[PDB]
């Protein structure tokens, strides 16, 4: 062991020291994976957990979400204008064609710096107000347009302001840019969560799911209103059955978030819930339909006594979502402790 | 068109059968078997705090990189067990790592759908991310450097890709796999490569052309592992159906099947010896198996891991085998 081998060994020892420090930091992290379906609420649950922290207007969280809302507003013009080419709809004023390139010319500059320039604001105002695009927006059924485009387009002036402060209603409707994996660190009441959202994962679960073998719990977001909104709740039931009864998540408790409960309250008044579930045979009011939907999700749960489902009707107004996750994770930790101590 | 495709499949199957004179067992039935490989753990590389998903040996046969779910990419001196570097990843969900043949770079990727290239030899003393290879819409299951500027990555989006690391662009996209592509093996001359996918197919690709030269389908389940034979005329696959297979590029066949009845776990990683006589396959049953690549019998077992052997690789000099596993340890065997 020469002098340089000694200094290489000392370097390896410092590396081990940092590795242990990092592992001790990460061991205190509680890893949860958000695992709801396509339009379920995972993104809005993570966003709502960030925002409503300590007051409904924790604005410092709202500051990081300005680029996303800008991108949604910016893409909204790009989506509506590009819809004209597929719909073969001509602009009422041909001068929009020059402005049509103008948005794409500034599209790169706006998304990269996370701001809406005044020139784009005029370009956006003119393009959106053009009747030809207005018909194009009305024909959104055949075009890939996010439902948040309508509200932002009606308030592009608020979005482009220099001191624009995103609002909770503005953020909660934004669509997080599709990213393979999404990690969110939450510290709630001395407990640090890492909500690991696997975003657009264009691959099979059976290959990447064991990467989350040792998560504390799974947060499964379900859209309650989606029972009649291509078999959205049937997709949630299939996904939940697969995830709950996964070989990797035998002892991993599931936090079941049932999202958009008020929207369900309107939809059942209009649409009967028997459409999704032909064998419902129950009342079509809320606090009956909701409990029914929980019952299906928690009845898909096989292999009880090892894992538990913590069902919650998510309230975007209050911190009952993060509080429920804290309570469920606390119960998960305490139950695990009871288990190896042998009491339960 | 579907009838024509099935007719062409039948034609390829008959053409393959026309070239199957004698099985590889019958031809190799007379060679003296290797006795029993007593590889022993010469080094245990400790320092990873989560499951190890990938390792790659350096071409100097002394350094190896490993990727773990603990978010670290560690470079080891396997002779001294010294940790040369510990690279913290932006995404801890890393499934693959590659070590550049120059040694100037490592790659890693996984659930972030990005191959990150790391500059090992920077003027500052740190390893930094030199390139983020975005463009895959699924996770990266494997990555392999062609040289300092080129790297082939397989993905769960069912496509392999050739990248220009300088520009960061997919120089070639290798489409044709229907299931998740789980592995790559560059040919020794790196003019072509094989990829195994979850559609139980192994596809021989042309790097320069960009086209699928051959498709190899003998497995019953997902192919997790693939490895070229040292002469580049054959490759071995390791699948979830608890079997390995040796395919020949020129015969376009499945020469040999490396299976045991009491082996029911899938294969996570396969590799060959320097002479290629040994196919060392890592298994879910916690222990790697040494196979006689020519006679299809287990020469030995590299038991010694407390969890699934997730990755393995034989040095370029053939001296040692490193097995990483989900028990967070790398063990050098010999």
């Amino acid at each position, epitope marked *: 062991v020469s002098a340089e081998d*000694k200094a290489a060994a000392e370097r390896s020892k410092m590396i081990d020291k940092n590795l242990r420090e990092d592992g001790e930091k990460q061991r205190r992290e509680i890893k949860l994976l958000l695992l709801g379906t396509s339009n379920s609420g995972k993104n809005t649950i993570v966003k709502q957990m960030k925002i409503i922290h300590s007051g409904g207007f924790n604005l410092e969280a709202c500051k990081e979400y300005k680029p996303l809302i800008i991108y949604n507003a910016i893409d909204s013009l790009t989506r509506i204008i590009r819809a004209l080419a597929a719909l073969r709809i001509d602009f009422h004023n041909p001068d929009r064609a020059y402005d049509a390139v103008q948005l794409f010319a500034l599209t790169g500059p706006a998304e990269s710096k996370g701001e809406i320039t005044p020139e784009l604001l005029g370009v956006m105002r003119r393009l959106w107000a053009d009747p030809g695009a207005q018909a194009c927006f009305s024909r959104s059924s055949e075009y890939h347009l996010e439902d948040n485009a309508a509200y932002y387009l009606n308030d592009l002036e608020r979005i482009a302001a220099a001191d624009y402060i995103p609002t909770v209603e503005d953020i909660l409707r934004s669509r997080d840019m599709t990213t393979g994996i999404v990690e969110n660190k939450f510290t709630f009441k001395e407990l640090t969560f890492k909500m690991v959202d696997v975003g657009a994962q264009r691959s099979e679960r059976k290959k990447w799911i064991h990467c989350f073998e040792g998560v504390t719990a799974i947060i499964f977001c379900v859209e309650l209103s989606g029972y009649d909104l291509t078999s959205r709740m049937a997709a949630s039931l299939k996904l939940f059955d697969s995830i709950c009864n996964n070989k990797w998540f035998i002892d991993t408790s599931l936090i079941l978030f049932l999202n958009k409960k008020d929207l369900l309250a309107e939809k059942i008044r209009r649409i009967p819930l028997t459409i999704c579930f032909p064998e419902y045979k129950g009342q079509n009011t809320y606090e009956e339909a909701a409990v029914y939907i929980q019952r299906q999700f928690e009845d898909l749960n096989r292999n009880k006594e090892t894992k538990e489902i913590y069902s919650h009707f998510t309230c975007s107004t209050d911190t009952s979502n993060i509080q429920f996750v804290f309570d469920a994770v606390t119960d998960v930790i305490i139950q695990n402790n009871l288990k190896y101590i042998g009491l339960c | 068109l579907r009838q024509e495709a099935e007719q062409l499949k039948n034609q390829i199957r008959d053409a393959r059968k026309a070239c199957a004179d004698a099985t590889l067992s019958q031809i190799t039935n007379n060679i003296d078997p290797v006795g029993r490989i007593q590889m022993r753990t010469r080094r245990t590389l400790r320092g990873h705090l989560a499951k190890i998903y990938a390792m790659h040996w350096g071409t100097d046969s002394r350094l190896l990189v490993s990727a773990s779910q603990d978010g670290k990419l560690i470079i080891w001196d396997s002779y001294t067990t010294n940790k040369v*570097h510990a690279i913290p990843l932006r995404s801890s969900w890393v499934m693959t790592c590659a070590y550049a043949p120059s040694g100037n770079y490592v790659a890693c990727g996984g659930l972030d759908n990005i191959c990150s290239i790391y500059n090992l030899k920077t003027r500052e003393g740190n390893v930094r991310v030199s390139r983020e290879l975005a463009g895959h819409t699924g996770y990266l299951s494997c990555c392999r450097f062609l040289d300092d500027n080129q790297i082939v990555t397989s993905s769960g989006d069912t496509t392999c890709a050739l990248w220009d690391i300088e520009t960061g662009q997919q120089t070639t996209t290798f489409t044709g796999h229907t299931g998740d592509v789980m592995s790559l093996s560059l040919a020794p001359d790196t003019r072509l490569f094989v990829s195994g996918a979850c559609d139980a197919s192994a596809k021989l690709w042309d790097v320069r052309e960009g086209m699928c030269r051959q498709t190899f389908t003998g497995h019953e389940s997902d192919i997790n592992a693939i490895c070229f034979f040292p002469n580049g005329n054959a490759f071995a696959t390791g699948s979830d159906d608890a079997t390995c297979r040796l395919f020949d590029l020129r015969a376009d066949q499945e020469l040999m099947t490396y299976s045991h009845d009491n082996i029911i776990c899938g294969i996570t990683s396969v590799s060959f010896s320097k002479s290629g006589r040994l196919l060392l396959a890592g298994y879910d049953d916690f222990n790697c198996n040494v196979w006689d690549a020519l006679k299809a019998d287990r020469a030995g077992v590299l038991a010694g891991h407390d969890n699934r052997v997730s990755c393995l690789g034989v040095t370029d000099d053939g001296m040692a085998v490193a097995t990483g596993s989900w028990d967070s340890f790398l063990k050098i065997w010999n």
Partner: single-chain antibody
Amino acid sequence: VQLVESGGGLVQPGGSRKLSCSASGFAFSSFGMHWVRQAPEKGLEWVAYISSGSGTIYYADTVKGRFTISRDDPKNTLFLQMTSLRSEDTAMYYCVRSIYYYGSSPFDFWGQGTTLTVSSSDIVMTQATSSVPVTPGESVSISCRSSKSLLHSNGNTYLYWFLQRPGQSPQLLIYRMSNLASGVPDRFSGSGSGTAFTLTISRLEAEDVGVYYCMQHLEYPLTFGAGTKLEL
């Protein structure tokens, strides 16, 4: 990447001063740092070595106890406190970046140095040849001899070659025997075995003029050779 020494100046003998080097543009916390001095007309003489993490410190036996070497990782500053400053402590003190892992390039970057002027078992690396006369475009070979085998049993030969170009800090050329440092033109080449070493410059240019230094890194008294100058 730079190292900038501070301190120096006229010091009354028996006094005390503290040298500082501010590191910039590199991960200073991960580099073992050396102090290497050069008497105002003599060769290089290694002073001290604080490793990365400060866990290991060495001194030249000529200055042990009188100097202490310290680093400020948050400040990226390397220090040398100097006490009982004799007359033989006059030198130009170079801080040397130095990182040790497999295949690393120790002694690869050197600071500008600060001249310090004071009022009035070690491996002997011998390069007895000095002031080799040579002309541009002509191959030259500088010898170096070692009082011990620099060949370690691990396969390394811890011989270093530096280039003190006139008015310039040493430039690492060959880090371990026959290893060309990055940025060194691929005409320099190191050779040797055991104790005898040769630095062959394939086709030298006007930049190669200067003084070429041996250095063993087999042990920690780090000893140089009396540099063999090249002169046009």
